[model samples]
Target: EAIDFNDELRNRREKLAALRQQGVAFPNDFRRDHTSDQLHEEFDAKDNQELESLNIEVSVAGRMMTRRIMGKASFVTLQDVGGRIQLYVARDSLPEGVYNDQFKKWDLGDIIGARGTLFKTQTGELSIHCTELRLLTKALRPLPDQDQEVRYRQRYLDLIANDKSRQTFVVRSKILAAIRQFMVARGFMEVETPMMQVIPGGASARPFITHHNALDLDMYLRIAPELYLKRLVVGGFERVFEINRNFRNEGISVRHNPEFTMMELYMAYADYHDLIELTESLFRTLAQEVLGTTKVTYGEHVFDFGKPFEKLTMREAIKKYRPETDMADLDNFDAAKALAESIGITVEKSWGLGRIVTEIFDEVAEAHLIQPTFITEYPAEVSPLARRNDVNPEITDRFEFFIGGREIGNGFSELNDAEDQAERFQEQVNAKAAGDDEAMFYDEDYVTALEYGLPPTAGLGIGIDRMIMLFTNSHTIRDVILFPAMRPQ
Candidate 1:
């Protein structure tokens, strides 16, 4: 039989009323002397007799997770930040009538504080023998079960109920810390850029538009901080990095979030090769320091960051994965279109040879890259912000990092030439006019900033959420993000 939710709510409310009448509701003075783990660590090795002789007094507070009452004596499990501990509460042990009147009526989820002496049960489980007990905070609403909607929409309940979920976030926090430390040690200065911009001139993505009330001007939530970070390079901030949220107007999926964290860095006088070396070291050191190993296991595949990450050109990757792919087939627009159509890729009418080739690579190669790999020589037609290769003007000096078949990061030698950047921006404008909603806008100001001069800079942007997912072995983008976007209920 199931208890009605309204009845449970009413029952808890009545209990709260009684506590309020007795002036014992929501007391804040109970300060804990130790957490659940601290007690276990210091006293677990000692036997019951040793504990009894030691007579360690502790004040502990946590939500009551489990309870069992046998006449006047009962056992309750208290869960705090460190974990759970068993508490032995007896009618005789507490003050007069306290067991039946107060303690017995306390609900499982109620926040309570206990003053006790340390002891071990006969089964060798560490427990507290309480002399004083008080309900600290009454949880009027009961703890809940979850679905994805509930988990994402109401994150507090998810954090309260799931240890694994909590630990994933904990590890995520540590990963970010380790990353910052790694970058700082490598002479990178962390900086902040505007989240809202008059012109979103970074990556090729639709931006979330907003209006500034005072100025009566339209602004956009940044899709990427690429242009601004490079602007810092122009201002002579030799090495600058920013770890912040980027908002894009996009569909939500297992791999994509509307708002996501990114760690984007720009280094002056550096090339894409320098970025590759830095990228390798960053991942290796991050794994070793954060997860205690360079070998990361995710979804039945193990990626070894200890060894060098494999390098392949875009065309090479496609050919390696889909051996039937001819290098010449990707060089011409009509040939590439035919190949893409054969591979079941729907080529847009506006797309050029480079875009068709990229689509072919995505179809044939992206998912097969199981190990840590860098696919380089991205097409200049699609790479508006990256430096064009000196030898091959059709391809940019860019690379996208992949592990476990997911794109983890993108890096490139920055396109610092104002004229080249302006031309690329105009091409983007043409694509936008031709109905590419994700095409970049022509940013005259960004071109002007480039005219002022930016050194040969290498920039890298790692998807921080995806990076956390790899380390935590979390399958979905939402698993790493605390508050993921969800449809309104």
Candidate 2:
């Protein structure tokens, strides 16, 4: 059922006919000199006497959000990017019959422009006394009340009506600006990498594939820009970064989105330790620049970015979070699998010793990390692209940062030895053949790029959406994203 909007619908279109007869319907000729935000900032402090003396006349435009008519004299509220402002209209101040015939009948969501002088209302509210008003665009349908499901589906209406929704994106913009400024200041040049790749080999996520109609070939939406970025490093553009989109075939949760943004960067001659320092510097600088403080709140938790972020190895984290488990189990596959199964982790033969350790840690320990902490020394099998620790071939030199009980970033030193990377790719190939849908396919071109001898380099990828959630204290990935994916109606 369409809920019978045709009654209100017809009434609005009839008004549209009247508007067309007057001059032009939805004409774009009218121009405003200032935004509602600009006028408020310029004149909000002036009192009635001061405002009258200042005589600040300006033209502004916004959507009509609220209107109250008291027969010939009325007040309407207009909303713009910054906020809302009240417009006071009186029949005595306007052209004859304009107030009685047209302005009073305008819809709530109509976009309009006004030329007026600033004034202070008796209630101490800042208002505009309009000399002229023109409807710029008419709203054909009224806004409906919505919940989270509906709001995610219809984000424009949500942004129009919800102040927090509007400001969240505003801060998101600020966050991006700050990140770019910080990186550029440190000599990192921004770049745009290929979105559609012949062989996607950056991170281990199932990719969304599409076909080129003309070429008749399948291309994968990039899972990460890591490979291309490192190729640039091999080409001697020492510092490179990309703030762009990546698509993954994955599950949706409060924290996950199928399509997401990543800030991935690589620096020549730097290792995971250097990447960790950069991570800390970026977050600390971002907090100071974007939020104006070192401390940010996430729901009930408060994290202090001003202080040192804790660093612990996977072994250490597992021991700390799962005190009941024996340390010996982490070193042995059978014992590790037994411990994992005891904690409700399903077992599979393809899940090698590395996967067993990771599974056990994730099931029992990951969610307990509420503050800023780095869990380092990922398993070799799990981190195929990361360089193995020289001392321990069993583990790779990698670290993942966690905040508010969720992984926010991951980084590592690039595996420069082409042969080791080839063997790793073969392992991934075996996993895929064994029916692991999340397994990565072997990309020979990426292996060839590594053979060219990429210098000692460090690369990091931070989830832009999850970082915004931490900064804004938003509850879900959908809350931070403007238009999150949804099932068809």
TM-scores for every predicted model = 0.97, 0.97
- The sequence of per-residue lDDT tens digits that candidate 1 reaches over residues 261-329 is 999999989899999998999999988998789888889989888899999999999989998777898
TM for candidate 1 is 0.97
Least lDDT summed over 10 consecutive residues: which range in candidate 2?
142-151
State which candidate has the highest lDDT. 1
lDDT per residue as tens, model 2, 101-137: 7788788888888888888999877888988888888
Candidate 1: residue 449 lDDT (0-100):
91
